Amino acid sequence: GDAPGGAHMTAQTVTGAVAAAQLGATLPHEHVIFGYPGYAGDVTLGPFDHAAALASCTETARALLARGIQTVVDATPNDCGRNPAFLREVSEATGLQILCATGFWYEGEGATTYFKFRASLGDAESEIYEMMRTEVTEGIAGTGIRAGVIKLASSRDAITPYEQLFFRAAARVQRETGVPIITHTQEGQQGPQQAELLTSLGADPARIMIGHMDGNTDPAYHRETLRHGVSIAFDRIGLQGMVGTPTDAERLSVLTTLLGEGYADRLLLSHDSIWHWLGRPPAIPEAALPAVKDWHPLHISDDILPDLRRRGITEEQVGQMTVGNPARLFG
Amino acid sequence: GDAPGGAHMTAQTVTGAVAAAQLGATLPHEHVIFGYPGYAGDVTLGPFDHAAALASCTETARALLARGIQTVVDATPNDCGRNPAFLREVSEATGLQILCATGFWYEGEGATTYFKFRASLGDAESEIYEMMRTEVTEGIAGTGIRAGVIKLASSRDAITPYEQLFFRAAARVQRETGVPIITHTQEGQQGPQQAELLTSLGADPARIMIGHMDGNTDPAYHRETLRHGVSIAFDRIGLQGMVGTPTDAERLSVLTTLLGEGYADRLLLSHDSIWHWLGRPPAIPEAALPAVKDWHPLHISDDILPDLRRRGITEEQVGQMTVGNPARLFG
Ligand SMILES: [Co+2]
Ligand SMILES: [Co+2]
Ligand SMILES: [Co+2]
Ligand SMILES: [Co+2]
C-alpha cells in the first residue's frame, strides 16, 4: 500500500546490512541493556559484569530465536547506556539480528544538560544532525557499527524545545538517508503531535513508528495518530501499572478494535523490556511485582499472540503486525 | 583555633596518602576534566582524545607547580565525567598532588534519573552512603584510588529532597571517617542553609567548605554562613558574568571586607576551572569571551594574590587562605 519513498539504505544491524526479507519476525522496541542517566556515577557499587550480562543476554536471545523471532530493534538512547559493541557480541554469539539506535531520551529523564548547554552556545540542532547522520551512515564511536534507526522521545505535556532539536535533526537525516524513526511518547500523550511534527518537517510517514501508543486507552487517540500515515506500536505489553501504563487486558481491547477497523498494516507489538540493567540491579518491592511479572521478551510470543488468535485475529493479521510491518518499516 | 574533631584519615590523593604538611599551597576547587551530563551520548563526534588531554593537563599541572601550587582538589562529581585513573596519570607525570571527590551534582543539571529511581524503590540514602564510604575508605571503580573529599551540591531555591539524600549520606560518612566535604551553591544561595543542615546532621564544621560563596556579593550572607564555624570558598574567581556570577572586582570587595573582619582562617580561593572539556569542545561566542578570559587556573597566582597584597592584605593572610586553611581542612 503506502511504500517508503525517497532515499533508502538496507537495514543496518550491529553485524552489518540485512535484506528486508531476512528480517523475519521482529520485536521493534526492546533494550538488551539499559541504564537510567546517572547510573555511570554508581560504578563502584554497580559495575557492569560483562561475562554475566553476556551470558544472560545470549540466553534471552536464544529463547527469542526458539520462538521464531529473528530480529530485535534495540531502542536504547545514547544517554541511557547504549553499547553497540556489546550488542554485536550478543548477535554474533547467537545469530539473533539486532539493530541499534541513535538519539537522546526525552527531557523529563534524559541526560539533558549537555545539549542544552550546546544549544545555549550555538546551532545544537545541526550538531545533533551531524551525530545522527554519522552514526547512521558511517558508524558509532569509531566502531564501524551503524545505527539502523533514529530514536526520538517527547515529554507528556508537550514536545519541548529541547526535544524539538532532536525531531528537527532527525527529519533532516530521514529525508537524506531514508532511515526509520521510532519514538517514545510519555504517559499516553503527544502521539498525534509527534506524527504531525515529523511529517510537517518532510519525514516519510512510511518510515515512522510512533511508540508507547499502548499508553493511551482511548482508540480515538490512536485513530488520530494513524490518520498521518505513520505506524504505531503497542510496545510496553507486559508492563502493567508502572509509569502510568494500563493493563494488558486494556491494551488488547484497543488493539482488537483497531484490528477490526482494518489498521493491521500500521500496528506493531513489543515489550520495551530490559534484559540486563546497568547500575545496581533494581530491587522490586513485593507490591510492584505483578506490574512487572509479564514484562519480559517472551510474553508476546507466549501469551499475546495466542490471546489475539483466540479472539478472532487471523494468522494473516498476526503475520502482518510481526513480520510484514517490520520488513517494510526497517528494511 | 577550631581543629577537626572526631574520626580522621590522612589526606588521600589519587597517588596515595599525603601528610597535611606536604599539601602546600592548594587550589581547593578545580576540574582537570569535566563533562556536562549527556556528553557521553555525543561520543561519536566528541570522543576523548587521551594523548591530547594528557599533554594539555600535564602542561597546566607544570604551570601550577611553577607558581608554587603543590595540590589541586578536583571537585568533579561522579556524574560529570569524573575519572580518577586519568587524574592519577596527570599527577604521576608531573608530581602535582590531586585529591578527587565522591558525590553527585545538584538536581538542576546533574544526571538525577538514576538515584531518583533508586529512591522511588527503597533507601537511596543508604545506597549513596555506601558508595561514598566505599570510595573514601576503599577505592573508586576497583582502581584502589580513593576519594579525598565528598562533593555535595544544591539548587538555588532550596536544597531539594533529591539533594538532601546526598547531604544526609555525606554527614554519615563524615562522622564515621572525618573526610572533608566541599560544596556547590547555585547562584549565590543556600550557603547558610547548607551549613545549618550539615552541622545539624552531626558533620564537623572544621571539615566543611561551603563553595561558590563568591556568587553572592552581600557580605551579610557570608557572615551568616561563617557563623556556623564552616569555611567558605570564593572558588569561581575569574568566571565573570556567567551562570549569574559577579565580576572579580565585586568578589575582591567582599573578600577584603571579610579579611578586615578577621575571617582569614575560614576563607579559601579557587577558580572552578576546567582544564579539558569532555564532549565536543565548547565554542565560546565572541561576546562571552571577557566572562571567561580570566577563568583559568593561573589567575589567582598571577592576578589575585598581587591585587590582594597591593590592597593591604598581608603575606600572612594570603598564606593562611592558600596554605594554612587547606592543610587543616583536607589534611
Ligand atoms: Co521509552
Ligand atoms: Co524503551
Ligand atoms: Co559547582
Ligand atoms: Co566545579
Side-chain angles (χ1 to χ4, degrees), chain B residues 147-198:
Chain B
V149 300
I150 289 178
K151 172 60 175 293
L152 293 180
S154 52
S155 302
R156 183 235 278 145
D157 301 327
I159 303 172
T160 75
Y162 169 84
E163 282 150 19
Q164 304 222 9
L165 295 168
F166 297 81
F167 273 71
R168 284 183 227 120
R172 273 201 246 171
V173 174
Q174 206 290 310
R175 293 175 60 63
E176 301 173 18
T177 68
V179 74
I181 289 167
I182 62 169
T183 85
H184 154 114
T185 52
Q186 181 70 17
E187 295 161 64
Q189 298 279 93
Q190 310 303 140
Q193 289 81 174
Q194 283 188 357
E196 170 59 17
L197 179 55
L198 288 168

Short mmCIF file of all heavy atoms in Angstrom, two decimals, chain B residues 147-198:
data_model
loop_
_atom_site.label_atom_id
_atom_site.label_comp_id
_atom_site.label_asym_id
_atom_site.label_seq_id
_atom_site.Cartn_x
_atom_site.Cartn_y
_atom_site.Cartn_z
N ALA B 147 38.77 8.58 47.14
CA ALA B 147 38.39 10.00 47.09
C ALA B 147 38.87 10.65 48.38
O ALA B 147 38.72 10.07 49.45
CB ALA B 147 36.86 10.15 47.00
N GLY B 148 39.42 11.86 48.28
CA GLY B 148 39.89 12.61 49.43
C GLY B 148 38.87 13.63 49.93
O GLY B 148 39.09 14.31 50.94
N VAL B 149 37.75 13.78 49.24
CA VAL B 149 36.72 14.71 49.69
C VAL B 149 35.36 14.23 49.21
O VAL B 149 35.28 13.43 48.27
CB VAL B 149 36.88 16.16 49.13
CG1 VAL B 149 38.21 16.76 49.55
CG2 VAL B 149 36.76 16.15 47.61
N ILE B 150 34.30 14.71 49.86
CA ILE B 150 32.96 14.38 49.44
C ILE B 150 32.47 15.66 48.79
O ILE B 150 32.68 16.75 49.32
CB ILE B 150 31.98 14.05 50.65
CG1 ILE B 150 32.35 12.72 51.30
CG2 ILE B 150 30.53 13.95 50.13
CD1 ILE B 150 31.44 12.37 52.57
N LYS B 151 31.83 15.53 47.64
CA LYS B 151 31.29 16.70 46.95
C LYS B 151 29.77 16.71 47.10
O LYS B 151 29.12 15.72 46.78
CB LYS B 151 31.67 16.61 45.46
CG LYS B 151 31.02 17.68 44.54
CD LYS B 151 31.39 19.11 44.94
CE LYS B 151 30.83 20.11 43.93
NZ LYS B 151 31.50 19.98 42.64
N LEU B 152 29.20 17.81 47.58
CA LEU B 152 27.75 17.97 47.68
C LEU B 152 27.39 19.19 46.85
O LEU B 152 28.25 20.05 46.60
CB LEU B 152 27.31 18.25 49.12
CG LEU B 152 27.50 17.11 50.11
CD1 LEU B 152 26.98 17.59 51.49
CD2 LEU B 152 26.78 15.84 49.58
N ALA B 153 26.12 19.29 46.46
CA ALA B 153 25.68 20.43 45.63
C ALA B 153 24.18 20.67 45.79
O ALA B 153 23.41 19.71 45.87
CB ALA B 153 26.02 20.13 44.14
N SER B 154 23.75 21.92 45.82
CA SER B 154 22.31 22.21 45.95
C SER B 154 21.81 23.19 44.91
O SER B 154 22.60 23.92 44.30
CB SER B 154 21.97 22.75 47.35
OG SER B 154 22.77 23.86 47.74
N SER B 155 20.49 23.23 44.74
CA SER B 155 19.86 24.14 43.79
C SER B 155 19.73 25.54 44.38
O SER B 155 20.00 25.79 45.56
CB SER B 155 18.48 23.61 43.38
OG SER B 155 18.60 22.31 42.82
N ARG B 156 19.31 26.48 43.54
CA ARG B 156 19.21 27.84 44.01
C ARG B 156 18.13 28.14 45.05
O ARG B 156 18.39 28.83 46.05
CB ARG B 156 18.99 28.77 42.82
CG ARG B 156 18.94 30.22 43.22
CD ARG B 156 17.67 30.83 42.73
NE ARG B 156 17.80 31.21 41.34
CZ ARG B 156 16.82 31.14 40.45
NH1 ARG B 156 15.62 30.71 40.81
NH2 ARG B 156 17.06 31.52 39.20
N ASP B 157 16.92 27.65 44.82
CA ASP B 157 15.82 27.98 45.72
C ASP B 157 15.62 27.06 46.91
O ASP B 157 14.81 27.33 47.77
CB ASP B 157 14.51 28.13 44.91
CG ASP B 157 14.62 29.22 43.84
OD1 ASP B 157 15.33 30.21 44.08
OD2 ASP B 157 13.99 29.10 42.77
N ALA B 158 16.37 25.98 46.97
CA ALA B 158 16.23 25.09 48.10
C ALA B 158 17.20 23.96 47.92
O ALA B 158 17.73 23.76 46.82
CB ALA B 158 14.77 24.52 48.17
N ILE B 159 17.48 23.26 49.02
CA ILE B 159 18.29 22.06 48.96
C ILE B 159 17.13 21.08 48.78
O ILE B 159 16.39 20.77 49.72
CB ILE B 159 19.04 21.77 50.27
CG1 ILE B 159 19.93 22.97 50.63
CG2 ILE B 159 19.89 20.48 50.10
CD1 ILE B 159 20.57 22.88 52.03
N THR B 160 16.93 20.65 47.55
CA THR B 160 15.83 19.77 47.22
C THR B 160 15.91 18.42 47.90
O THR B 160 16.94 18.02 48.40
CB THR B 160 15.77 19.54 45.70
OG1 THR B 160 16.82 18.63 45.31
CG2 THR B 160 15.93 20.86 44.96
N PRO B 161 14.78 17.69 47.92
CA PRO B 161 14.70 16.36 48.53
C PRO B 161 15.75 15.44 47.91
O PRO B 161 16.40 14.65 48.61
CB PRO B 161 13.28 15.91 48.19
CG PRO B 161 12.52 17.19 48.24
CD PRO B 161 13.44 18.20 47.55
N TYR B 162 15.90 15.51 46.59
CA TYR B 162 16.91 14.70 45.92
C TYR B 162 18.29 15.06 46.48
O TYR B 162 19.08 14.20 46.78
CB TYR B 162 16.87 14.95 44.42
CG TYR B 162 18.04 14.36 43.65
CD1 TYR B 162 18.03 13.03 43.25
CD2 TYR B 162 19.15 15.16 43.30
CE1 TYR B 162 19.06 12.49 42.51
CE2 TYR B 162 20.21 14.62 42.55
CZ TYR B 162 20.16 13.30 42.16
OH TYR B 162 21.17 12.76 41.43
N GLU B 163 18.58 16.35 46.60
CA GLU B 163 19.89 16.79 47.11
C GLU B 163 20.09 16.35 48.57
O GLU B 163 21.17 15.90 48.95
CB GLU B 163 19.99 18.32 46.99
CG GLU B 163 20.31 18.74 45.53
CD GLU B 163 19.76 20.07 45.12
OE1 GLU B 163 19.41 20.90 46.00
OE2 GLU B 163 19.68 20.31 43.88
N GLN B 164 19.03 16.45 49.36
CA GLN B 164 19.11 16.07 50.77
C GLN B 164 19.55 14.63 51.00
O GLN B 164 20.16 14.36 52.03
CB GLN B 164 17.79 16.36 51.48
CG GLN B 164 17.42 17.82 51.32
CD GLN B 164 16.88 18.47 52.58
OE1 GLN B 164 16.92 17.87 53.66
NE2 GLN B 164 16.38 19.70 52.45
N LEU B 165 19.26 13.73 50.06
CA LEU B 165 19.68 12.34 50.20
C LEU B 165 21.21 12.28 50.28
O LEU B 165 21.77 11.52 51.07
CB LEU B 165 19.24 11.52 49.00
CG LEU B 165 17.76 11.30 48.71
CD1 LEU B 165 17.65 10.71 47.28
CD2 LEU B 165 17.15 10.36 49.78
N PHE B 166 21.87 13.09 49.43
CA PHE B 166 23.32 13.12 49.42
C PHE B 166 23.91 13.80 50.67
O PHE B 166 24.95 13.37 51.19
CB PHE B 166 23.82 13.80 48.10
CG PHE B 166 23.43 13.02 46.87
CD1 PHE B 166 22.15 13.14 46.32
CD2 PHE B 166 24.31 12.11 46.30
CE1 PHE B 166 21.77 12.35 45.23
CE2 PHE B 166 23.93 11.30 45.19
CZ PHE B 166 22.66 11.42 44.67
N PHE B 167 23.28 14.87 51.12
CA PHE B 167 23.73 15.60 52.30
C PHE B 167 23.66 14.67 53.53
O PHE B 167 24.60 14.61 54.33
CB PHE B 167 22.85 16.82 52.55
CG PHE B 167 23.29 18.06 51.79
CD1 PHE B 167 23.14 18.16 50.40
CD2 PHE B 167 23.86 19.13 52.48
CE1 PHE B 167 23.56 19.32 49.69
CE2 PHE B 167 24.30 20.31 51.77
CZ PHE B 167 24.14 20.40 50.38
N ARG B 168 22.56 13.93 53.65
CA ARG B 168 22.41 13.02 54.79
C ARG B 168 23.45 11.92 54.69
O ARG B 168 24.11 11.60 55.67
CB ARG B 168 21.00 12.43 54.83
CG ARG B 168 19.96 13.41 55.35
CD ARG B 168 18.55 12.77 55.46
NE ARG B 168 17.62 13.71 54.85
CZ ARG B 168 16.84 13.46 53.81
NH1 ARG B 168 16.79 12.24 53.27
NH2 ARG B 168 16.07 14.43 53.35
N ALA B 169 23.60 11.33 53.50
CA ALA B 169 24.60 10.25 53.35
C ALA B 169 26.02 10.76 53.67
O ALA B 169 26.83 10.06 54.31
CB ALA B 169 24.56 9.68 51.94
N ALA B 170 26.32 11.97 53.22
CA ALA B 170 27.65 12.57 53.44
C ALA B 170 27.90 12.80 54.94
O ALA B 170 29.00 12.56 55.42
CB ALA B 170 27.75 13.91 52.71
N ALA B 171 26.90 13.36 55.63
CA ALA B 171 27.04 13.61 57.08
C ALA B 171 27.40 12.31 57.79
O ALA B 171 28.27 12.29 58.65
CB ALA B 171 25.73 14.20 57.65
N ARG B 172 26.78 11.20 57.39
CA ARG B 172 27.08 9.90 57.98
C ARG B 172 28.52 9.46 57.72
O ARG B 172 29.23 8.95 58.61
CB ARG B 172 26.19 8.83 57.39
CG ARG B 172 24.86 8.63 58.06
CD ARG B 172 24.40 7.24 57.67
NE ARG B 172 23.23 7.29 56.84
CZ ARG B 172 22.69 6.25 56.21
NH1 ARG B 172 23.21 5.03 56.29
NH2 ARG B 172 21.60 6.47 55.48
N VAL B 173 28.96 9.62 56.48
CA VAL B 173 30.33 9.21 56.16
C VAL B 173 31.31 10.16 56.86
O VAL B 173 32.40 9.76 57.26
CB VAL B 173 30.59 9.27 54.60
CG1 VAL B 173 32.06 8.99 54.30
CG2 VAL B 173 29.73 8.24 53.89
N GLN B 174 30.93 11.42 56.97
CA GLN B 174 31.81 12.40 57.58
C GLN B 174 32.02 12.04 59.07
O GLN B 174 33.15 12.03 59.57
CB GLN B 174 31.21 13.80 57.44
CG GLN B 174 32.25 14.95 57.45
CD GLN B 174 32.92 15.20 58.80
OE1 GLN B 174 32.24 15.32 59.83
NE2 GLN B 174 34.23 15.29 58.80
N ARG B 175 30.92 11.74 59.76
CA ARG B 175 31.02 11.39 61.18
C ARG B 175 31.87 10.14 61.36
O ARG B 175 32.64 10.03 62.29
CB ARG B 175 29.63 11.15 61.77
CG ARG B 175 28.79 12.41 61.83
CD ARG B 175 27.38 12.09 62.31
NE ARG B 175 27.34 11.49 63.65
CZ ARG B 175 27.74 12.07 64.78
NH1 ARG B 175 28.25 13.31 64.77
NH2 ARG B 175 27.59 11.44 65.94
N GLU B 176 31.72 9.20 60.46
CA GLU B 176 32.46 7.96 60.58
C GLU B 176 33.92 7.95 60.15
O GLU B 176 34.70 7.14 60.67
CB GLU B 176 31.72 6.87 59.82
CG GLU B 176 30.30 6.67 60.35
CD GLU B 176 29.48 5.70 59.51
OE1 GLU B 176 30.08 4.91 58.73
OE2 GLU B 176 28.23 5.73 59.66
N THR B 177 34.29 8.83 59.22
CA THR B 177 35.65 8.84 58.68
C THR B 177 36.44 10.13 58.84
O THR B 177 37.65 10.13 58.67
CB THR B 177 35.62 8.54 57.17
OG1 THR B 177 34.99 9.64 56.51
CG2 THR B 177 34.79 7.29 56.87
N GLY B 178 35.75 11.23 59.10
CA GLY B 178 36.43 12.51 59.26
C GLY B 178 36.70 13.19 57.92
O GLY B 178 37.17 14.33 57.87
N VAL B 179 36.36 12.51 56.82
CA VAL B 179 36.63 13.07 55.49
C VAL B 179 36.02 14.48 55.28
O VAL B 179 34.95 14.83 55.81
CB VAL B 179 36.13 12.07 54.37
CG1 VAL B 179 34.62 12.08 54.29
CG2 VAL B 179 36.73 12.44 53.00
N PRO B 180 36.75 15.36 54.58
CA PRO B 180 36.24 16.72 54.33
C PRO B 180 35.07 16.71 53.33
O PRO B 180 34.92 15.79 52.51
CB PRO B 180 37.44 17.45 53.71
CG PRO B 180 38.60 16.58 53.90
CD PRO B 180 38.10 15.17 54.03
N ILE B 181 34.28 17.77 53.38
CA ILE B 181 33.16 17.95 52.50
C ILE B 181 33.28 19.32 51.82
O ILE B 181 33.52 20.34 52.51
CB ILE B 181 31.81 17.95 53.28
CG1 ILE B 181 31.51 16.54 53.78
CG2 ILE B 181 30.65 18.48 52.39
CD1 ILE B 181 30.35 16.49 54.83
N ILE B 182 33.12 19.36 50.49
CA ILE B 182 33.15 20.64 49.77
C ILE B 182 31.86 20.72 49.02
O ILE B 182 31.31 19.68 48.62
CB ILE B 182 34.36 20.76 48.79
CG1 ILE B 182 34.29 19.69 47.70
CG2 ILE B 182 35.65 20.59 49.56
CD1 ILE B 182 35.33 19.95 46.53
N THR B 183 31.33 21.93 48.85
CA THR B 183 30.05 22.07 48.18
C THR B 183 29.97 23.08 47.03
O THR B 183 30.85 23.94 46.84
CB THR B 183 28.92 22.49 49.16
OG1 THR B 183 28.93 23.92 49.31
CG2 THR B 183 29.13 21.85 50.56
N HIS B 184 28.86 22.95 46.30
CA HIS B 184 28.49 23.83 45.20
C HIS B 184 27.22 24.48 45.68
O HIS B 184 26.33 23.77 46.14
CB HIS B 184 28.15 22.99 43.95
CG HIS B 184 27.20 23.65 42.99
ND1 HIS B 184 27.58 24.04 41.72
CD2 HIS B 184 25.87 23.93 43.08
CE1 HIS B 184 26.53 24.52 41.08
NE2 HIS B 184 25.48 24.46 41.88
N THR B 185 27.12 25.81 45.59
CA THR B 185 25.87 26.53 45.87
C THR B 185 25.54 27.12 44.51
O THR B 185 26.43 27.60 43.77
CB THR B 185 26.00 27.71 46.89
OG1 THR B 185 27.05 28.61 46.52
CG2 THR B 185 26.30 27.14 48.30
N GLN B 186 24.26 27.07 44.15
CA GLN B 186 23.81 27.59 42.89
C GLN B 186 23.39 29.05 42.98
O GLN B 186 22.57 29.43 43.81
CB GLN B 186 22.62 26.76 42.38
CG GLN B 186 22.07 27.20 41.05
CD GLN B 186 23.01 26.92 39.88
OE1 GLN B 186 23.95 26.12 39.99
NE2 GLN B 186 22.75 27.57 38.75
N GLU B 187 23.97 29.87 42.11
CA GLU B 187 23.64 31.28 42.02
C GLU B 187 23.61 32.09 43.32
O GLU B 187 22.70 32.88 43.56
CB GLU B 187 22.30 31.43 41.26
CG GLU B 187 22.38 30.99 39.77
CD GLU B 187 21.01 30.68 39.13
OE1 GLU B 187 20.18 31.61 39.01
OE2 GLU B 187 20.76 29.51 38.74
N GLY B 188 24.63 31.89 44.15
CA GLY B 188 24.72 32.66 45.38
C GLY B 188 23.64 32.43 46.44
O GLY B 188 23.33 33.35 47.21
N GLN B 189 23.09 31.22 46.51
CA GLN B 189 22.05 30.91 47.52
C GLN B 189 22.30 29.59 48.24
O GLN B 189 22.96 28.70 47.71
CB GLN B 189 20.68 30.81 46.86
CG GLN B 189 20.21 32.09 46.21
CD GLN B 189 19.63 33.01 47.22
OE1 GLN B 189 20.32 33.87 47.78
NE2 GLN B 189 18.34 32.81 47.51
N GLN B 190 21.71 29.49 49.43
CA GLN B 190 21.73 28.29 50.27
C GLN B 190 22.99 28.06 51.04
O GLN B 190 23.14 27.02 51.68
CB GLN B 190 21.36 27.03 49.46
CG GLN B 190 20.06 27.18 48.64
CD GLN B 190 18.86 27.55 49.51
OE1 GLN B 190 18.00 28.38 49.12
NE2 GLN B 190 18.78 26.93 50.67
N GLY B 191 23.91 29.03 51.02
CA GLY B 191 25.13 28.84 51.79
C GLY B 191 24.82 28.61 53.28
O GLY B 191 25.30 27.67 53.91
N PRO B 192 24.04 29.51 53.89
CA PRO B 192 23.69 29.33 55.30
C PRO B 192 22.91 28.02 55.53
O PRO B 192 23.14 27.29 56.52
CB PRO B 192 22.82 30.54 55.59
CG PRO B 192 23.47 31.60 54.72
CD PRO B 192 23.64 30.84 53.41
N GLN B 193 21.97 27.73 54.62
CA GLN B 193 21.16 26.52 54.76
C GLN B 193 21.98 25.25 54.67
O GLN B 193 21.69 24.26 55.38
CB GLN B 193 20.05 26.49 53.72
CG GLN B 193 18.93 27.49 53.95
CD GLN B 193 19.23 28.91 53.47
OE1 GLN B 193 18.36 29.77 53.51
NE2 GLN B 193 20.45 29.16 53.02
N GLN B 194 23.01 25.26 53.82
CA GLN B 194 23.87 24.07 53.73
C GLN B 194 24.66 23.86 55.03
O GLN B 194 24.86 22.73 55.48
CB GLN B 194 24.89 24.22 52.59
CG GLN B 194 24.34 24.00 51.17
CD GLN B 194 25.50 24.00 50.16
OE1 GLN B 194 26.66 24.21 50.56
NE2 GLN B 194 25.20 23.75 48.88
N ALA B 195 25.16 24.97 55.59
CA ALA B 195 25.96 24.91 56.81
C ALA B 195 25.10 24.40 57.97
O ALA B 195 25.52 23.53 58.75
CB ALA B 195 26.53 26.33 57.12
N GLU B 196 23.90 24.94 58.08
CA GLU B 196 22.96 24.54 59.13
C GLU B 196 22.60 23.06 58.97
O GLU B 196 22.68 22.28 59.93
CB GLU B 196 21.70 25.40 59.08
CG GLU B 196 20.55 24.90 60.00
CD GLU B 196 20.93 24.83 61.51
OE1 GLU B 196 21.94 25.44 61.91
OE2 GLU B 196 20.19 24.17 62.29
N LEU B 197 22.23 22.66 57.76
CA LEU B 197 21.86 21.27 57.55
C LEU B 197 22.97 20.30 57.92
O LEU B 197 22.75 19.34 58.70
CB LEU B 197 21.40 21.03 56.09
CG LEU B 197 20.99 19.59 55.71
CD1 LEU B 197 19.86 19.05 56.68
CD2 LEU B 197 20.44 19.55 54.26
N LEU B 198 24.17 20.52 57.39
CA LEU B 198 25.27 19.61 57.66
C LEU B 198 25.69 19.52 59.14
O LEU B 198 25.92 18.42 59.67
CB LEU B 198 26.51 19.98 56.79
CG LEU B 198 26.32 19.62 55.28
CD1 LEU B 198 27.44 20.28 54.44
CD2 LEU B 198 26.34 18.12 55.10
#
